[PDB]
């Protein structure tokens, strides 16, 4: 379920483009840093579960 | 990627095509201005003649 939610969210962000209007100015998204893991660690996590 | 390469050459072609048109009119203006001096020169030629 977690990966399905992430896939849907990333699919939406890929679907939106410069022509779309649901956009907004979101200042500071660069300076904010919220991260828990790297892709290699995520892949290892899924591998260990399997 | 082929579309993106196709897009790149489209933008490059467009910019140079823009400038070429910008040169033809500037050369066209210098043509009419050059030609207009000939018609005036018949004036002082007549006075001198």
């Amino acid at each position: 379920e977690d990966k399905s939610s992430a896939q849907y969210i990333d699919e939406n962000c890929f679907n939106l483009r410069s022509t779309s209007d649901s956009i907004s100015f979101f200042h500071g998204v660069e300076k904010f840093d919220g991260t828990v893991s790297i892709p290699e660690t995520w892949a290892k996590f899924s591998n260990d579960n399997i | 990627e082929r579309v993106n390469d196709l897009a790149f050459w489209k933008s490059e072609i467009t910019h140079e095509l823009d400038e070429m048109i910008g040169e033809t009119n500037a050369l066209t203006d210098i043509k009419r201005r050059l030609e207009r001096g000939l018609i005036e020169t018949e004036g002082p030629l007549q006075v001198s003649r």
Binding site: E11, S46 | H15
Partner: protein, 63 residues
């Protein structure tokens, strides 16, 4: 009062005008070039954006 220095003064004014005009023309040329460069750079970088998002979605689907 300055019989022939008058000609030097008019010459000075004229050449000042010419130099300013030449600099202006150079600046217009550079402005057009930098505009084209920035436009192309932004488009190349956004298509790289799209390709990398697509790759990540593919890997997520596989897992």
């Amino acid at each position: 009062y300055t019989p022939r220095d008058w000609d030097r003064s008019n010459d000075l004014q004229i050449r000042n005008a010419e130099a300013s005009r030449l600099w202006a023309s150079r600046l217009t040329g550079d402005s057009l070039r930098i505009m084209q460069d920035k436009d192309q750079l932004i488009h190349q970088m956004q298509e790289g954006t799209s390709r990398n998002l697509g790759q990540r979605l593919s890997d997520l689907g596989f897992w």
